[PDB]
Amino acid sequence: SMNPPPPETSNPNKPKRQTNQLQYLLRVVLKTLWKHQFAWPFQQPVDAVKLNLPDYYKIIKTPMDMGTIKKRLENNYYWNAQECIQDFNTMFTNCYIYNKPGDDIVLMAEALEKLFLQKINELPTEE
Ligand SMILES: Cc1nnc2c(NC(C)C)nc(-c3nc4cnc(N5CCOC[C@@H]5C)cc4n3[C@@H](C)c3ccccc3)cn12
């Protein structure tokens, strides 16, 4: 079974805006998470074909990854900080849905989510 197209990362029809919260999500949240030792399985869309997971896109209907989130922030795709936070939440929930609790990949996602929530707790007020 083939891979689906990756999630949309740029749309010229969508309105664009610069806010302190979106800047914090790219410069602090995405940067700190990308550098983490457990980031590598979440840095790109799941390649179900290469990893031989034919049931991945049969179970996960709303895929998300940090590579997509990074591209979305770089292309001013998000209007609200909540849209970006929702994508990170979707990425973590997808990992917990597809894999069994206690599996190494789940433990990896749990450590990244713990760091993510701490950085979202330090999110600055809207300017
Ligand atoms: C996101 C996300 N949510 N669930 C998964 C998931 N589930 C499997 C562990 C069943 N795997 C990956 C996932 N993303 C990957 C990215 N690259 C590879 N590589 C294998 C080929 O050589 C080079 C390259 C580095 C393997 C990957 N895997 C699995 C195979 C894996 C294996 C060991 C440790 C952690 C993950 C993401 N996932």
Numbering used by the authors: 42 to 168
Task: Give sentences from the paper.
To demonstrate the relevance of CSPs for the identification of favourable CH–π interactions and their contribution to binding affinity, we analyzed a matched ligand pair (ligands 3 and 4), which are structurally identical except for the interaction interface with Trp81‐η (methoxy propyl vs. phenyl). ITC measurements were carried out to extract binding affinities and thermodynamic parameters. Although other contributions, for example, differential solvent effects, might play a role, our measurements highlight that the robust improvement in overall binding affinity for ligand 3 can be readily observed and (at least in part) attributed to improved CH–π interactions.
The binding domain 1 of the bromodomain‐containing protein 4 (Brd4‐BD1) that recognizes acetylated lysine residues, was chosen as model system, due to the availability of a large set of in‐house protein–ligand co‐crystal structures. Brd4‐BD1 contains three tryptophans, yielding a total of nine signals. In the following, we show that, in the case of Brd4‐BD1 ligand complexes, the CH‐groups of Trp81 are sensitive reporters for favorable CH–π contacts and can be easily monitored with 2D 1H‐13C HSQC NMR experiments. In order to provide a comprehensive assessment, we selected a set of 13 ligands for which both crystal structures and affinity data were available.
